[PDB]
């Protein structure tokens, strides 16, 4: 069986119907949004229903008696009209077909494309410790009805309307080229003796819930030990809109028990996963959704194409293996960091249904940790 | 003179007194209800009176004590003994020895104090286009007679008491919030420059029938003009018992004679007055009172103190300040959303200051004309 | 008939450097170089090298008690020539050097500095008490020192045996510019659906510091209301553009006329107003060519991007624009005010198509130069 | 035992007594000069003893003087009650006898602590101090026309004003800075903590240095410094910066990499074989002498009638492969504001031993 996500306005005249709540970005190309609307042909004696998708990057969080701040940045905007119909979404999919059969006379399909230049879902709220406000890129579908003269008079009424906040979820592209090791080596000199720190991944692009075995090898020439070896996943975050806001966040960690003596080597694999489930704590990192909701996970890997400005893209997400060497004095120690850069995304995507239909609205986790609840939907009784 | 609400029961045993129809919650401290009851001394042969201080939640009809109400939560109550006499049976204020000494030998003074937990006299009767019910906080003073039976079932019939519904209406405290001050500026699709929008208020209490100064700055560094700038008063209502019924309702609006055209910015002052005689439509709204009544005001903003679960106020009501622009070739175009901000302020009644002559009156409020 | 020479001496007296101006010209097409000559005491440079190196560097950050201390430097132009011992590193002489040279004696060596073309001009600001923002400008050091063998190597290039000069790169406007438009705009704002008509109009776009602008401002008031009042200022937009987002906009030159303009009537007026440092006590919280406390310094000037550079490089963006504001009448204890821009660039004139006299590369003070923070004593002391 | 320094007049007629060479400031307050007079009541007969404190500001070998305060008391003949103010001078009467008076000098809140120099070969500049001077002496006079000083009836200690630790310090210091060098695109960035904002004299400081190289190049050398700044502010703006401590990492920092180290340093007197061109609270000849304490200029107080500014900062110089003569002329520096001075203070009849006030010679 097929699960269809709908959505129905407040005042029962307009019901959206949605193939996923989440859209795949592979890079090549974005999944477009095929759906229906049900009208109840009463309510809309008249009117004409809409459907928009509108891509927007906003920055600012309501706070008790500091100044009200916000920000908001629309990337993309398209509309096509769904009632009464006209084929504004051109020629029909399999899904729009059978869902017109399944649903009845007063469903009438519509189709928004994504373009090439857009980011995907990223948003974060800070953490106590972060300066920076709540931001995000979020992707609104919003099925709504006007009469003659309210486009006229910028009374588009609440009730008659309906909403969905999708995800466009990053996918590594179905076709790429095998896969380089991602690797470095470093030559600390202490007292004109190396320190050599090489550190592999088994490759450069990682699925979120993929195991990254981190192979960490330690020549030691110098008179020192290294007492401690720290192996991280960083995830780094950069706002490029509005402020130029910088997180940077420990998502995976193994401390090793290994010292590795003077004139000496040691060879260590490390197996991490960078998973939200890793911290109660889910601010102050770039997310795909709300910290509330249970299918929300870590952030892809930021991707800009060649030729767009990454400013257009909101948030920069990054990730990064980081490992830290403590070494020995005497009375204290020294630390040494570097870092091997590596991309997280989902798995390459693949290559008449039986409906059963379930409410766009994704469900809250058991335990998110402290989060602030943002502003409610304003979609109450207005008139 | 001195204007004193008086009820008297069906059977005539039972008189109620009070100073005021209305009790001052100014946030430190609630006003304390002193009253007095007169009884028949000949229809009390035998007979104990007692005054309760009610607060109750309800939801689905008008009144508390309505047969088959959806939802009753009683958030506070209080009775002491007025007969036969407590101890001393002494006044506590000037007022219950002045009133005493007017009515004679058969007029026994009582204290109800509210504690500081409580919300304030709130309720709306729903509109047409609204879908939740009646809901409200009501606030009752019943002095009733007991007596006892030869079976051991005491009795508390209705003929014997009598029922006065107060308001607990909110003054504002000795201190203030900061300045309300909102900033919003948006990118419109395929546009390099930023539509600014700066609103202030002079400050964060207005009393009821005080104007509320809204000053703008919209800097318009677009291509494009805005057609218009609309100032709202919005109350928000939250049913926080039985029902999670939201209401959003305007209760002023401005609309700015001045557009804003491109590469230039414009700095306005709109006066807005918010004011239940200002809505032809009094339903769909949060009141202190019924619509019927004349002395019927919109609810003060809720205040929640430290350490107090939000339910337990029934309906949380709250203002904001909307300001939306109109943008030329927008909507339809670039948008299907509002350009708007709010700026939260809170509306109150003012904060109250630091051998009388008798004037005996229908508790009953008067109703509008 | 004299020419004026800037000399400056070492703490150890082994080198003296002479320079022909203090005020080097940027006029777009071409930036004048740096040519001078250094003098050393032969017998405290046995056995020594040196050098003259022009840095242009953009510096962030200031000195605060008990504030954390957080600075940024980037050097957006590093260049050296070796003086002495002599090997013709500056190239061919120009007449200046040979001058100095035969009026100097036997120790005196040439050196040639060039600027090249994708620099910015002298621009600094120190901040005022309301702004946020710290210290940042663009610094021009010219510095002689004297090298022994091993003293490079070693990062030990002793300061007493070394001489700083900060010269300031001034812009200039082009020699054979084409003929200007006029700087004009106008607005019409609504208001009740009739028409207040604001045109602003300049005699030419680019004005030079000390030059009268002509600000002609016509009002046609359609409208039921009273135009009551009518400012006009000459305002400077600072941009910090390197590590830190920083924006000043302050009033240069101002002229309020009290004089209204009634419902249905239309007044011309043309005001002068020549925006100047001497203006204002307060030099701090605008963009300057040079040192608050310093008598020579004036307002920057006018950036010029040249095609192909990335504005970012000038570190400090600053510009000019007329500002008018109308206080129009409203319904009322407040009427309201609507307010335009039209920008201008403001530079120094056109550059023109011996006996010495020596005198300290050291500007003069201002006797009244108001507020401002001493910058950390020059580091000439005792080491 | 209670160690007390004593001096003698030429004369013999009057003998001063000291609890201390070295009188605290702790901010808050200046410990008073509290001590006694034995005088020999016959070479005293007729005659008046007072005992003054004075601190000046002095330059050259005397090219300039000024007096920053002055303040006298008469000790003989006694004065009202002749009753001791402190414990100290109650047991010193009843150990010296019926000649002895008592003597009570406070201090005000707006004077500096002993700062000097003499200037080493390499520096322009001279001798200058802040010198505080005890002197008890007799007046007399033989004739009415004029009172007569004779400076074998005089006796002057030259005792230290020594800066002590406050209640509280200030926040712990903090820098941050970093370079672009010419045609990198790359920062070098440095942040360097310290534990706390004032130290104690001979307290060793650790110093938190975090380099994150994210250049092409090698940070070759990371030195730490103590600089002490010396800034003269009356009569001559001599200005001296002078290395107290210094501490050279043996570690590399290679391209695209960071490393985190903590330096210890203790800036002492006696790690410097050269006293001579920096600020000491005492004459370089003698032992008891030590680097001077941070100046602590009040509120509202003209730092000019501190006479000599003293401060401390961490300097932290990185060596950066292929930049010095290629890509800079420029030292790769930061520097961390600190204070240096002496630690907080603390809060039947005492047993005396005396001894030469005189300071003892290295």
Not at 116 to 130: F, G, K, N, T
Not at 190 to 214: C, F, N, T, W
Request: charged fraction near 25%; charge should be negative; glycine fraction near 4%.
């Amino acid at each position: 069986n097929h699960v269809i996500f709908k959505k129905i306005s407040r005042d029962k005249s307009v019901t959206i119907y949605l193939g996923k709540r989440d859209y795949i970005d592979h890079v090549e190309r974005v999944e477009p949004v095929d759906g229906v609307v049900l009208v109840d042909p009463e309510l809309v004696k008249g009117k004409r229903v809409y459907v928009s998708l509108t891509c927007a990057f906003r920055y600012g969080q309501e706070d008790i008696d500091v100044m009200g701040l916000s920000f908001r940045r629309d990337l993309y905007f398209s509309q096509v009209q769904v009632f009464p119909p006209v084929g504004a979404s051109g020629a029909t999919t399999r899904l729009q077909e059978s869902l017109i059969k399944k649903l009845g006379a007063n469903t009438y399909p519509f189709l928004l494309t994504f373009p090439d230049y857009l980011p995907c879902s990223v948003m974060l709220q800070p953490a106590p410790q972060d300066v920076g406000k709540s931001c995000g890129v979020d992707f609104e579908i919003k099925a709504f009805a006007t009469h003659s003269t309210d486009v006229e008079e910028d009374k588009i009424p609440k009730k008659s309307s309906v909403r969905l906040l999708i995800r466009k979820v990053q996918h590594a592209p179905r076709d790429m080229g095998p896969q380089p090791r991602a690797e470095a080596s470093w030559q600390f000199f202490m007292s004109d003796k190396p320190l050599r720190l090489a550190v592999s991944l088994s490759k450069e692009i990682y699925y979120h819930g993929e195991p990254i075995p981190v192979t960490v090898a330690v020549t030691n020439s110098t008179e020192k030990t290294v007492k401690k070896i720290k192996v991280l996943v960083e995830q780094v975050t950069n706002v490029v809109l509005y402020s130029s806001d910088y997180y940077i966040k420990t998502v995976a960690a193994e401390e090793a028990q290994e010292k590795v003596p003077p004139n000496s080597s040691l060879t260590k694999t490390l197996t991490l996963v960078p998973l939200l489930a890793n911290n109660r704590e889910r601010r102050g990192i770039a997310l795909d959704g709300k910290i509330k909701h249970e299918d929300t996970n870590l952030a892809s890997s930021t991707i800009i194409k060649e030729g767009i400005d990454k400013t257009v893209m909101g948030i920069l997400v990054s990730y990064q293996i980081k490992v830290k060497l403590t070494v020995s004095g005497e009375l204290t120690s020294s630390e040494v960091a570097t870092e091997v850069p590596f991309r997280l995304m989902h798995p390459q995507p693949e290559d008449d249904e039986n409906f059963v239909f379930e409410e766009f609205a994704r469900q809250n986790l058991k335990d998110a940790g402290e989060y602030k609840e943002e502003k409610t939907d304003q979609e109450a009784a207005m008139d």
